[PDB]
Amino acid sequence: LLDSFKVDHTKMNAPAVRIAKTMLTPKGDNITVFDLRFCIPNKEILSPKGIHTLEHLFAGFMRDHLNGDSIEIIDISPMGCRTGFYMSLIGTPNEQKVSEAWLASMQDVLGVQDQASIPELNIYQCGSYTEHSLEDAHEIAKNVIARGIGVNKNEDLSLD
Amino acid sequence: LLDSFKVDHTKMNAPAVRIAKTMLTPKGDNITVFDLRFCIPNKEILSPKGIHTLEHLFAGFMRDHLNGDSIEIIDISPMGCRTGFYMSLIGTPNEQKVSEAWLASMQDVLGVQDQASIPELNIYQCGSYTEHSLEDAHEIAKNVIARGIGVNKNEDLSLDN
Numbered sequence: 387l388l389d390s391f392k393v394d395h396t397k398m399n400a401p402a403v404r405i406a407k408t409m410l411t412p413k414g415d416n417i418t419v420f421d422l423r424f425c426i427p428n429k430e431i432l433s434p435k436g437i438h439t440l441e442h443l444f445a446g447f448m449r450d451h452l453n454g455d456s457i458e459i460i461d462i463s464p465m466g467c468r469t470g471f472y473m474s475l476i477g478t479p480n481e482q483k484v485s486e487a488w489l490a491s492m493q494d495v496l497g498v499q500d501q502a503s504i505p506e507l508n509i510y511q512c513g514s515y516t517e518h519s520l521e522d523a524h525e526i527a528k529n530v531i532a533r534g535i536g537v538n539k540n541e542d543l544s545l546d
Numbered sequence: 547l548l549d550s551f552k553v554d555h556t557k558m559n560a561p562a563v564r565i566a567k568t569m570l571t572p573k574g575d576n577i578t579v580f581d582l583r584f585c586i587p588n589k590e591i592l593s594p595k596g597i598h599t600l601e602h603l604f605a606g607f608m609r610d611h612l613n614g615d616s617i618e619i620i621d622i623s624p625m626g627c628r629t630g631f632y633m634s635l636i637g638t639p640n641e642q643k644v645s646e647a648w649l650a651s652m653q654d655v656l657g658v659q660d661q662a663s664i665p666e667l668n669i670y671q672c673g674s675y676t677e678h679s680l681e682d683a684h685e686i687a688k689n690v691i692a693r694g695i696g697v698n699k700n701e702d703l704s705l706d707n
């Protein structure tokens with residue numbers, strides 16, 4: 387039933403941006419959900435601590451590069467399969483705009499030099515404060531920068 | 547900066563529902579993001595495989611119980627901290643309605659008897675088809691049902707400096 391079950395994962399490129407779905411609010415406003423695929427499904431996977439550290443940094447940097455007059459990010463969360471993130475937002479930016487904000491966000495991640503520099507890693511502001519790894523996050527960022535970010539279109543991912 | 551960082555996790559009850567934020571689209575439609583907290587922060591945590599299996603089931607069951615004329619779920623995803631899920635949707639249901647749909651979804655999870663019974667767990671429909679544990683998901687569901695779903699309100703979670 388779920389939309390992610392209707393797309394062929396063996397045909398996905400990664401790192402890559404895919405518009406998962408678009409929705410219209412009652413009054414006619416647009417909501418878009420993006421599949422930010424970091425890893426090749428079933429060939430690569432992010433570590434639990436790395437994806438957690440990346441989530442903190444990424445949810446902040448993506449908002450820095452993407453929020454504006456026509457865009458308001460609703461939520462950015464890691465996928466259970468740990469091969470990427472889902473980003474939902476008010477607005478209708480295309481894959482290119484999203485991929486360029488993602489790329490700049492990876493450079494930003496690399497700019498975060500030490501874990502001790504991340505303020506919110508304590509029992510008051512984080513749910514599992516010791517479940518972190520800036521090193522894994524740095525490694526993921528460098529890998530995305532080195533591989534480049536492509537695009538996946540639902541039309542080319544049909545399942546029979 | 548992030549909203550999640552402005553609330554005191556040491557004061558949160560779990561399992562519990564919290565309205566993390568409400569937003570207005572340009573035309574004035576409502577969007578609500580819910581923090582479905584399964585675990586007491588920094589005391590309990592969900593397993594990586596268990597939260598993955600739970601994600602599949604929960605995302606489907608919550609939509610069955612909540613989607614209707616004035617509610618449309620945008621996304622339901624696990625938190626990096628593995629202590630819960632964030633659910634974003636078009637609409638304005640309150641904590642009680644969400645908690646009841648959640649509780650019902652837990653019973654639904656218990657109704658999924660064998661992992662081999664879950665269709666989408668393959669290389670075509672899932673990104674990490676082997677990273678699953680129906681056992682952990684059942685354990686999580688029973689735990690939630692046994693403990694009951696409370697409510698956390700942003701007002702009671704104020705954080706000093």
Ligand code: MET
Nearest residue numbers: 442445461462463548550
């Ligand atoms: C602060 S970690 C990310 C929390 C939430 N998923 C957000 O997009 O803000």
Ligand code: MET
Nearest residue numbers: 390601602605621622623
């Ligand atoms: C792979 S389970 C589906 C998860 C996705 N975030 C959804 O809300 O449908």
Ligand SMILES: [Zn+2]
Nearest residue numbers: 512513514627
């Ligand atoms: Zn955290």
Ligand SMILES: [Zn+2]
Nearest residue numbers: 467672673674
């Ligand atoms: Zn999956």
